[PDB]
Amino acid sequence: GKRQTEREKKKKILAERRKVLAIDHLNEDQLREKAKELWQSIYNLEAEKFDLQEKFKQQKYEINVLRNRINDNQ
Amino acid sequence: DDEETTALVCDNGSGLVKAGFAGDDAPRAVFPSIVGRPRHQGVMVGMGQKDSYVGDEAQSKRGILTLKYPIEHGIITNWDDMEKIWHHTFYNELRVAPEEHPTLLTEAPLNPKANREKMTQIMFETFNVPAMYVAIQAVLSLYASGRTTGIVLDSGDGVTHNVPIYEGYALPHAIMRLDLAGRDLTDYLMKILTERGYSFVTTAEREIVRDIKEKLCYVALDFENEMATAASSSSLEKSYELPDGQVITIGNERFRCPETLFQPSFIGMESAGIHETTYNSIMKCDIDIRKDLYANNVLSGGTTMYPGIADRMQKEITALAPSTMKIKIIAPPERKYSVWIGGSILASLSTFQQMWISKQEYDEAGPSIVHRKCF
Amino acid sequence: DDEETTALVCDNGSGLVKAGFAGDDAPRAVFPSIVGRPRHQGVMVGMGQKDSYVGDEAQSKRGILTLKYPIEHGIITNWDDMEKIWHHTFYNELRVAPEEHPTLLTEAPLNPKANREKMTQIMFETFNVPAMYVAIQAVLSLYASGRTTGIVLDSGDGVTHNVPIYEGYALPHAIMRLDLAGRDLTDYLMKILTERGYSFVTTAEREIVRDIKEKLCYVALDFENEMATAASSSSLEKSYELPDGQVITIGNERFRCPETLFQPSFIGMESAGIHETTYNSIMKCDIDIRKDLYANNVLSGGTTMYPGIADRMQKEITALAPSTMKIKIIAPPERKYSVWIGGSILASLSTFQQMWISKQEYDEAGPSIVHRKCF
Amino acid sequence: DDIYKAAVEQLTEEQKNEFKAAFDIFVLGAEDGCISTKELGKVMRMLGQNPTPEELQEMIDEVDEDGSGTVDFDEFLVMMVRCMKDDSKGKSEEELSDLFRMFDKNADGYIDLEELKIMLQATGETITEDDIEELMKDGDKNNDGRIDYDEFLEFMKGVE
Amino acid sequence: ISASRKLQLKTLMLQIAKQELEREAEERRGEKGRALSTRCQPLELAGLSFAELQDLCRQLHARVDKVDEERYDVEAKVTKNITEIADLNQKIFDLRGKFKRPTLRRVRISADAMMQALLGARAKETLDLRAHL
Amino acid sequence: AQKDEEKMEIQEIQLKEAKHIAEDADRKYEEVARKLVIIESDLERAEERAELSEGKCAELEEELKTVTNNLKSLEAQAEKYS
Amino acid sequence: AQKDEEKMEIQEIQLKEAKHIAEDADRKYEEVARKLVIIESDLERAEERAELSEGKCAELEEELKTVTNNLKSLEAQAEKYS
Numbered sequence A: 001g002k003r004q005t006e007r008e009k010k011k012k013i014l015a016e017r018r019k020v021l022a023i024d025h026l027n028e029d030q031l032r033e034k035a036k037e038l039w040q041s042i043y044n045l046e047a048e049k050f051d052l053q054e055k056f057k058q059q060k061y062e063i064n065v066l067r068n069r070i071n072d073n074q
Numbered sequence B, C: 001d002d003e004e005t006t007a008l009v010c011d012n013g014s015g016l017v018k019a020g021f022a023g024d025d026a027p028r029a030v031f032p033s034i035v036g037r038p039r040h041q042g043v044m045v046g047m048g049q050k051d052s053y054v055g056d057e058a059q060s061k062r063g064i065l066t067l068k069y070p071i072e073h074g075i076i077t078n079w080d081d082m083e084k085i086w087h088h089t090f091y092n093e094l095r096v097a098p099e100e101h102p103t104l105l106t107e108a109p110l111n112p113k114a115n116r117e118k119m120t121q122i123m124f125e126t127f128n129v130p131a132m133y134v135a136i137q138a139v140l141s142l143y144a145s146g147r148t149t150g151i152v153l154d155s156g157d158g159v160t161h162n163v164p165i166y167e168g169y170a171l172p173h174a175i176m177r178l179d180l181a182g183r184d185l186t187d188y189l190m191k192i193l194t195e196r197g198y199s200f201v202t203t204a205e206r207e208i209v210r211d212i213k214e215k216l217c218y219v220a221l222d223f224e225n226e227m228a229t230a231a232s233s234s235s236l237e238k239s240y241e242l243p244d245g246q247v248i249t250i251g252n253e254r255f256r257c258p259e260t261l262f263q264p265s266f267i268g269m270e271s272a273g274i275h276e277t278t279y280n281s282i283m284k285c286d287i288d289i290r291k292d293l294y295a296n297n298v299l300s301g302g303t304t305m306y307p308g309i310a311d312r313m314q315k316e317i318t319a320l321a322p323s324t325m326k327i328k329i330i331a332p333p334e335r336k337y338s339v340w341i342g343g344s345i346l347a348s349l350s351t352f353q354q355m356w357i358s359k360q361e362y363d364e365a366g367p368s369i370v371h372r373k374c375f
Numbered sequence D: 001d002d003i004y005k006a007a008v009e010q011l012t013e014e015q016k017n018e019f020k021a022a023f024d025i026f027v028l029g030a031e032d033g034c035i036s037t038k039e040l041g042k043v044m045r046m047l048g049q050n051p052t053p054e055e056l057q058e059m060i061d062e063v064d065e066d067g068s069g070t071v072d073f074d075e076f077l078v079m080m081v082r083c084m085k086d087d088s089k090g091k092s093e094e095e096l097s098d099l100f101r102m103f104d105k106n107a108d109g110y111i112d113l114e115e116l117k118i119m120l121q122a123t124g125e126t127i128t129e130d131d132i133e134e135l136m137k138d139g140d141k142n143n144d145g146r147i148d149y150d151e152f153l154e155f156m157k158g159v160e
Numbered sequence E: 001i002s003a004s005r006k007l008q009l010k011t012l013m014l015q016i017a018k019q020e021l022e023r024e025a026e027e028r029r030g031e032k033g034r035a036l037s038t039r040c041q042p043l044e045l046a047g048l049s050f051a052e053l054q055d056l057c058r059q060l061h062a063r064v065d066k067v068d069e070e071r072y073d074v075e076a077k078v079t080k081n082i083t084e085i086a087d088l089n090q091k092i093f094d095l096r097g098k099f100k101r102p103t104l105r106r107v108r109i110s111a112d113a114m115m116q117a118l119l120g121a122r123a124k125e126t127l128d129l130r131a132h133l
Numbered sequence F, G: 001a002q003k004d005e006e007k008m009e010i011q012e013i014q015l016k017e018a019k020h021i022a023e024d025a026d027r028k029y030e031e032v033a034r035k036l037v038i039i040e041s042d043l044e045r046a047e048e049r050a051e052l053s054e055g056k057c058a059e060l061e062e063e064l065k066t067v068t069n070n071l072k073s074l075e076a077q078a079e080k081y082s
């Protein structure tokens, strides 16, 4: 519902994480370290998202069992 | 199932919303189309009381609600409530997001244009479907019978319309739409019950009167003989238990409620009954296709489920029609869902797959696209 | 406990003041609500004789006092005495200054407005509480049962009221408030005891008659059979020892005192008993929630503690009601404190935490704020 | 399981005081020398506070499975755990939800009888009269052959 | 019918179910480790100038932003699922679980354990008042 | 001696209260015994009758299946007749 | 005073016995309350399931009646068309 506000919020959050770097604010070794830091953050995010997907699978389980119970009420 | 994409065959109707995926035998979710706000004050805190119960939930809490149908006679009179009903239908009764499914609504004949245009605008802007198509409620009922000719009398709950079709060519000048339907029969039954002492007034008790009508009323084969019999014997008086006890006994109100269909003068309507508007609809057709229409008269819609109507109607038409023609009335047992079964069949066809109103087409011509070639 | 702030769930009642902190099982301090000035002269000097003994202290010195209840029938007739009772309740029975605690009073339905407004004005000006809220005494008793529907008959000591509730939506047009309660039963018992020779007149001896009523009286399952049995045998005569000896024997006065509840013609009241005002309160409700109210009839209040009332009432209602409905009478063993337990539960809710009448709101709109949205 | 955690958590300020008071009051000796190995019941009688009967029954049964009839100081701590409300209080509802999810890893909308059958086959417990009987009673709570979520939801509720 | 055997079977089933749940958790941890391992990008850092380093950094940042966008979308979907699950939970609560309030409270603190002290204090006060004379 | 007598009076009142406790306990216990027995009997009867209804319902299912099949047959015959 | 002390100690032991009887009655009360709560819950479930069964039996009976009557009519018509 109201996809415009959701899109605006997602774009704002992405712009918050718009980690664009300058030219003389880092080093080449520092740039590699930043790349590895982003890699590790993405891996932690992937683990969190996989846990979220498992939790959403359990949410689907709860959804179907609850709708089944509600239909069983009548 | 799996890949691919299935169509949503929704059917707004007026009284029962019937929906389900294309290609099945019966609608997946059938529930009354009523939206009822609570009317009392409410003292318990934190009970989780919502502001509007829609669908089948408001038929269980109807004791403290004010149910109000959003569709009066085919046309839609309250667009916010109709949007709420559609949202419920998509998300809670089918649990399929509309962003990935074509929709096939249904509409009565001779309805206002603005209703249809607003319907398509809602479906394309709010729910954001990929493509939707609007079809006349009688052609589908003709699909479901497996015929290709015949004159179909689709006596729903909102409006009764009678569309004749021959060899697939609809006759637009012979559609006879009459606004007597199940709702007026419910009101008339509620009005004649007062002759014994039972008074139903609240909009919630209209549902109880509807249940009485469904379970007890029947159409008499001959009206005067039944009126004479019910006034002498007592073999007709059937009793029924209200939702709280205090059983009631319905006498000759049983066959007087649905008799209004064949004599609309009972509720003050001028027009002729459903037995004579069919004959008039036939006589407007050409002289060479009248035999086929006589032989393939089709019944559909909910209100044509009264026990004994397929014989009364045949007797009446045989009285009106010439003596040589054979009069046959097709009354399939799956009458109530005939329109939706036909809708599923139509949506499952390969030849029909390019008739949908694609979204880019709507973006180029606006909501008035529905009246154009994509009908 | 510790930080944070707990609410004071006071419950004025009429006959017993019940109070305690929110979130417990039972009220902390329960004591009669009587204020009795001494009436004799007093000759000992320096005995430390006060001018008014309130609460449970005046039930021990009642031999030389003139006890007078400050609450007649729900309403409060003597505001100075009620203020004294509240001051005692806060400072000596709970020992918590009211400057740091919200309060949740309780009030009978259909009471005069001025009573409620004066109550809130006192609580905000004299005791200077942070925020107070007034709740109807029957909704709490419905909270305590853990239900959300049901019709509750809260027969206190001042006034008997019968509030039906469905799905959390109270029905304001079906509240039947009757002014027969425990006090009138005490007076009638004191009046029929004179038929054996025992005369109680002093306002102190009303307490003795109340004790007799509590310990001996019971509600007969069938009145005429009990009247016939007590007039032939002597298996009912139970004896009781007065506060000074001279035991008394109560015969058929045992079940005649509480019978007044079901036949208010005994004390000259016109209205129908508590067995028929419940059925009338149900019949005023809508036709679709009568089954649920029949099945969830709730008893509360002190006076409904007579041994054998939950069967007499069920028999009477089953006689009145239609034969198909099931009649069930919920009579929890913790009947007396049911209202206060419900009050504790309501005050402990998180959803309710923003309904209090905050002091700044009272400063802006005056005492008439209670009738406004913050009910 | 939680029994070992309860035994460890016996060491506190309240339950230690209870144990010390019990020892100082009715653990002295100077009896007739009958060897009162069943003094656990005597401790229950002298407790003055009777806990839930399940705790007492489990204390009498589950301990000394070898029939030793002798109780150590660790067993004194276990008995004192059984005295107070040191139970896990039906474990965590999250555990029940995770168990139900693992049962419905096949996404059947309820715990099918096949799940309990294969779990019983894996555990190898002897098929007694109560075996299958309990499965049919819980699954057919409606006695219609349909197994609903609430059945095993409340069945697994109230226990640790 | 056998209460002892019923309890034994229930306990054994609970224990074996807990062991299976722990095995499933270990399997999930292994799957998560596999997913983290297979999600790394094979990249080279030989013979690339700092301009190429900045270009690679911008490409990796764009991919990270895309992954974050997808994660936020999935988080929104799971939040919607949580809201509808809570709606179903309160539906069940009002259907059957309305008795939570008489369960969520504090009982048996002092009223059920300290009640005779009032009578004792009353008697002591009476004795003291008598001895005042 | 006077102090001892005061002690005796206190003990007397406490004994009175104890007997009072005993009586009220017995009364409530007998009440709950009555309710227990009535509830148990009614529960037994209700379970019995409900199971009876279940059996009858299954029989009705089978009857309905028979009738449905026969109606299919008659319908085929009628249409061929047409 | 000696006699009074005797009576004092006798009432003292009596009071202790009274307290113990009180605690025993209290425990019994809690127990029976638990039992009654359980059995009543079972009563609720039994009644509700009975009602479900009865309703379903009613519906199946009615449908059987309708279909049977239709089949009989069509049988008569089959003979007629013969």
Ligand SMILES: Nc1ncnc2c1ncn2[C@@H]1O[C@H](COP(=O)(O)OP(=O)(O)O)[C@@H](O)[C@H]1O
Binding pocket: B012, B013, B014, B015, B016, B017, B155, B156, B157, B158, B182, B183, B186, B210, B213, B214, B215, B301, B302, B303, B305, B306, B336
């Ligand atoms: N078995 C029945 N017997 C008699 N009338 C019925 C029966 N079932 C439905 N009706 C009437 O038909 C109406 C439902 O018609 P329906 O075909 O659902 O309308 P719509 O065309 O809007 O879907 C109900 O309002 C009811 O009055």
Ligand SMILES: Nc1ncnc2c1ncn2[C@@H]1O[C@H](COP(=O)(O)OP(=O)(O)O)[C@@H](O)[C@H]1O
Binding pocket: C012, C013, C014, C015, C016, C017, C155, C156, C157, C158, C182, C183, C186, C210, C213, C214, C215, C301, C302, C303, C305, C306, C336
């Ligand atoms: N055990 C009992 N048996 C009979 N009557 C009782 C009993 N306990 C209290 N009552 C009556 O109930 C009254 C107390 O009612 P209560 O619920 O305290 O009123 P309120 O609603 O003002 O608190 C007493 O005046 C007494 O007459």
Ligand SMILES: [Mg+2]
Binding pocket: B013, B014, B137, B154, B156, B157, B301, B302, B339
């Ligand atoms: Mg229709």
Ligand SMILES: [Mg+2]
Binding pocket: C013, C014, C137, C154, C156, C157, C301, C302, C339
């Ligand atoms: Mg009260």
